[PDB]
Amino acid sequence: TLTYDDIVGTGLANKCPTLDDTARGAYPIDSSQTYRIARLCLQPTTFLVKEEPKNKRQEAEFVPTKLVTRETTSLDQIQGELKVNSDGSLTFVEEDGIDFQPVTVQMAGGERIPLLFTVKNLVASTQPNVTSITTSTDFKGEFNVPSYRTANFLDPKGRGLASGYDSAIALPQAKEEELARANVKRFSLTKGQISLNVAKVDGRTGEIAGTFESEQLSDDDMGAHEPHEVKIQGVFYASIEPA
């Protein structure tokens, strides 16, 4: 039970809470009660990026990468409704929280891959018939991945979507067709997928923990280039409460 001053600068603030090996119980679901996730935490331990090989034929593989933006990657303080469905499955509907982190990783050879690691607007559901959440429960869901930069962001020549120049002003008489992809900024919105595999349950407290894997696109630099496919693996923590 630690204070800020115990934690500040250790790296522990980017780590999700854990559960003891003894937490292999079952958290009862009373189909009559309303429920919430009062805290969801996601702590990535690995970023993989799918390679883009020269001929489609040979499946491209996800390869390991080097994190260059330090211990700034976790999602936390996320909350929302935990619905009990007709078939006894549960559906988590994310309402709010620190549900995104920009992250840059680096491929072998140095190429940097920024991504907006996120679960924004996550809707994730368990199997049917979850009378108790146990270490057999899984959540599978989809979430939105908005553009890594938001609409005000200006490039190094001052061009932007909701602000900025709309041409390459340093090349006043250049033909504009060849610069259209750089000049006309576009705002991506794509889908990601995540699975949460419950490995530990404290039936008393309503806390669960486990591992996650999500898949999503990386930054496209407001439409300047094609995004990469990213797979994030890590651990998660959630506390469930009667709402």
Binding site: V63, M107, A108, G109, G110
Partner: protein, 50 residues
């Protein structure tokens, strides 16, 4: 696109004797996430300049 398609002359001599990785993480046989230690291609170049 191996080294001999790219006009590389000393790279194959480093490779022949066991220097096959870069500090930036790739290897000549197409690996990723390798740690060559000091004796990467860059470490060999630096040693010769010193």
């Amino acid at each position: 696109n191996p080294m001999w398609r790219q006009g590389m002359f000393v790279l194959p001599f480093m490779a022949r004797l066991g220097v096959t990785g870069s500090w930036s993480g790739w290897s000549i046989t197409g690996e990723t996430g390798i740690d060559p230690g000091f004796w990467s291609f860059e470490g060999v170049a630096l040693a010769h300049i010193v």
